[PDB]
Design a protein around this ligand. Structure first.
Ligand code: XIS
Ligand code: AU
Ligand code: MG
Lengths: 87, 107, 95, 14, 98, 95, 107, 82, 98
DNA sequence: ATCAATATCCACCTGCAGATACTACCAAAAGTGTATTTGGAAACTGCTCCATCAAAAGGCATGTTCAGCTGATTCAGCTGAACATGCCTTTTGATGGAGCAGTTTCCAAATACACTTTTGGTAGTATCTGCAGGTGGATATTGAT
DNA sequence: ATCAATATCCACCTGCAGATACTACCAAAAGTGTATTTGGAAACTGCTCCATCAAAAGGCATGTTCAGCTGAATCAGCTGAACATGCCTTTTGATGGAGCAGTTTCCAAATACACTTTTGGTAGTATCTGCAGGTGGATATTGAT
């Protein structure tokens, strides 16, 4: 077949400018240079937790495809209830 | 002479549907005749409250079509809807304009 | 093409009652849908528990009503209780 | 053969 | 040549991003990061495109919320610059950590 | 004068397996009761949701196991899943 | 002729009671044969874990009777139990000895 | 010599709570601020408890009324039933 | 004439109260405060003995937690003295208001 | 350093509150035997997800420059910690009855069934229209001087 | 307080993307209107345990003295903002390929249900004892000198 291209270091696609923008929406005026790496770490932890729960629902359903509903159920469990994607 | 339980009760919200969802959701063995009517009415009340305020946010922003930003402005600017929905995220809602005073310039 | 059902039809009625010249995006409708399912579950859940707490097997308007007093804040509860007490009393004395 | 804890102690035998 | 003083463009940016609702992380990078983390839990996973958008909407709303709390932590220490110790204190008090 | 059930008898047995010389106060036993009832509700709760999400009328070992993976941290989940599979094994192999 | 579902499963926790509490609980219409075995095993495991570590804490205070203080010490001193019970108050548990370093006197 | 019930929550008691919380030094404004927070906490819990009482058509607030109230306010308490 | 220096008894109280589990508010004042607040919701109300104890347990655990978070906010600002703004910031980040 | 005041620590003691242990009674778990419901196994869709690629805005990286923020230092004044007493409030221990809860009784209310009727979904079609994105041109804000 | 660089505002002006609004349309679900079941409000009463109230007991209100903390003022180093410049990667919008969700039909296990048989678990009770006090005397800690 083709087998997937290897995925490494994708956390670095969360660029300094993208984090500045998120900080601005959150009302931040000045940013220490150390904030970018600290934000990537906090983001990885948050995604790993939500994906681990979403994939657990995917596997329980005996599916290979993660649905919007799997993510929505994982976010609800995590107390980060999301409107706009069903349920 | 088929009347919907909605029309009997004077509600836009479907009493039928709500009775069923209380049935299939395993909330209790048995569901009283009152329950669905009361619930459909509360849900209808709340959606009317949100659409009133979001309607106003649409009109304030010179718009005819309510978008998620208008629902976010409506909910976040209302002390009680904000508390009811304090652990909810409205996709494509954004945040309220708010700058901490010390961050503004000059003396 | 499996019939997947929503509260759209009823949300749109209520939109037209309160703001007769106003539209709603499908996204905004998506949110209004999430909002109805959410408050439904929260109220049904409180009611479920309330009944179990009182060794009852029936959810009546009385369990819904208490659930609304527990879930909604002050004024929304007041008004919500009115519309639900009304809608019932009417539904009863419309038979 | 009963309940095995994380510390590596068991619950007796039969 | 005429320069804005430090903070003038930062305030311009706060006003602009607080007015808008667009996702602020690039779409493709964020999708790769989702696929990487998911792949490390389970190989041969696919995603509904709406799953990834749902994750992205949930991640941005979380980080925005966290930066508001972090900013309150910097301002409580009489600074205007957020530092790691502000995020850490926010997360500790949110009970996201011990 | 009616029967007030608890898990006291079972907590006391598991205490004797684990710490044969060790006793337990009335207040400590009340906390252990609260504990069991709480984890009971959390796990049944997730199982109920799992079944409802998958349009199933039935909570099996599989819904309990997924519920445990969602609710217990790291090593607690691992060990709990293994105690649970082991008890179902032993019970299926019992004429 | 009668053997408890517990004695078959190798458990001290009551498989029969758990089965009934699942029925009278409105979790689902039906209940697989294993589900109450598994559930009762999980609850017994977690009980053993806590009574293990609480026993240790009791012994360490030169004590042979577990009290709430011993339960709180066991739980809050274990990363995993502490997370599982993060939003829970053990009555009469007090807190862990913890003085922030900057509050210690200079010499 | 009559005073509010809230002031029955005295400086020395609030000072003891802080101390279990690992606090070394306390501003004098804390005592009134703490009484404020305490009132809100009890308001919010006692409201929900009493709503449980009324639903059970009772005139006595049970431990269960309180435990059920604490649970839904996200302050689950162990050792009083449930 | 021998006198302990400021903070030396404070530390001793910290060590003492973190070691024990006794309720630290007097029972009767608390009972009175419960009954007052409750009166505003339903009159002629009785309370089980255990109901009031449940409330005191919950309420003291809550305040002790809040003083810990408050202490971190004070220490954050490079102080050792807790102030109203420290309680207020702890409550804000916990999501108890604002 | 020394010197003393007070706090803390460990061994031993012992009364009884609060455990463990024991018994008979019955609610509720298990046993057996039909009575229903389900949740794969097979076998097909179309949906929609992966992939790959081409062309072009659009945002990212990096290096330079200096405004002004952070944090170290110093210091004065005010604000909390400590402490010595007695009185006032709480804690303790001993009675009347409110009301919880035990329980049985019967009907108003909810279920079960199987009809008939109507709503709400969707697919398809067209049919309309709000507004995003663009472009000038008039107007406001910022920062040098 | 003057001026110029540059951001911001607002009113026009498009072309769809996405909204609204027909259908016809049908399939599932809601409704209807008896046949059957039963859960819970009703009424009664007993016996807990809650409110109250009067002696026993230490905890708290108080005012004074000053240790040392907070916050103000100052300053220099250097971090982080702004911005210009160069160009890589994301966005966008196709096309083709298939993996896999999602349906719909037989059922042989699997679990529910109705009834009977059995006993584990509860509530009195009835003993047993872990340990919270208390005392004595050694040593450690703190703060004066
Ligand atoms: O999650 C916590 O429990 C936590 C506690 C304290 C701090 P602040 C902190 C600052 C000074 C003394 C003590 C703590 C901090 C963290 C990193 C570097 C510098 C200061 C942050 C987090
Ligand atoms: Au900090
Ligand atoms: Mg990998």
């Amino acid at each position: 077949k083709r087998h997937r291209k290897v995925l490494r270091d994708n956390i670095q696609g969360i660029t300094k400018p993208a984090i500045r923008r998120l900080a601005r929406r959150g009302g931040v005026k000045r940013i220490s240079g150390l904030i970018y790496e600290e934000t990537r770490g906090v983001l990885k932890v948050f995604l790993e937790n939500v994906i681990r729960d979403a994939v657990t629902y995917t596997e329980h359903a005996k599916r290979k495809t993660v649905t919007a509903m799997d993510v929505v159920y994982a976010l609800k469990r995590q107390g980060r209830t999301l409107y706009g994607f069903g349920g | 002479k088929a009347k919907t339980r909605s029309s009997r009760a004077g509600l836009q919200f479907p009493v039928g549907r709500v009775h069923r969802l209380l049935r299939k959701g395993n909330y209790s063995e048995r569901v009283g005749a009152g329950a669905p009517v009361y619930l459909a009415a509360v849900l209808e009340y709340l959606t009317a409250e949100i659409l009133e305020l979001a309607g106003n946010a649409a009109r304030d922003n010179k718009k005819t079509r309510i978008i998620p930003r208008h629902l976010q402005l409506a909910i976040r600017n209302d002390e009680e809807l904000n508390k009811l929905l304090g652990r909810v995220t409205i996709a494509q809602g954004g945040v309220l304009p708010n700058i901490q005073a010390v961050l503004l310039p000059k003396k | 093409r499996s019939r997947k059902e929503s509260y759209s039809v009823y949300v749109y009625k209520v939109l037209k009652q309160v703001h007769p010249d106003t539209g709603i995006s499908s996204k905004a409708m998506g949110i209004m849908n999430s909002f109805v399912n959410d408050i439904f579950e929260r109220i049904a859940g409180e009611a479920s528990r309330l009944a179990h707490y009182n060794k009852r097997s029936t959810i009546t308007s009385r369990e819904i009503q208490t659930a609304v007093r527990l879930l909604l804040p002050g004024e929304l509860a007041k008004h919500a209780v009115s519309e639900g007490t009304k809608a019932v009393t009417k539904y009863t004395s419309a038979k | 053969p009963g309940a095995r804890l994380r510390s590596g102690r068991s619950t007796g035998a039969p | 040549p005429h320069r804005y003083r430090p903070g003038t463009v930062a305030l311009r940016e706060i006003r602009r991003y607080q007015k808008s609702t667009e996702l602020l992380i690039r779409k493709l990078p964020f999708q790769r990061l989702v696929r990487e983390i998911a792949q490390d839990f389970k190989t041969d996973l696919r995603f509904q495109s709406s799953a990834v958008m749902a994750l992205q909407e949930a991640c941005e709303a979380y980080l925005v919320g966290l930066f508001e709390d972090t900013n309150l932590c910097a301002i409580h220490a009489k600074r205007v610059t957020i530092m790691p110790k502000d995020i850490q204190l926010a997360r500790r008090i949110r009970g996201e950590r011990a």
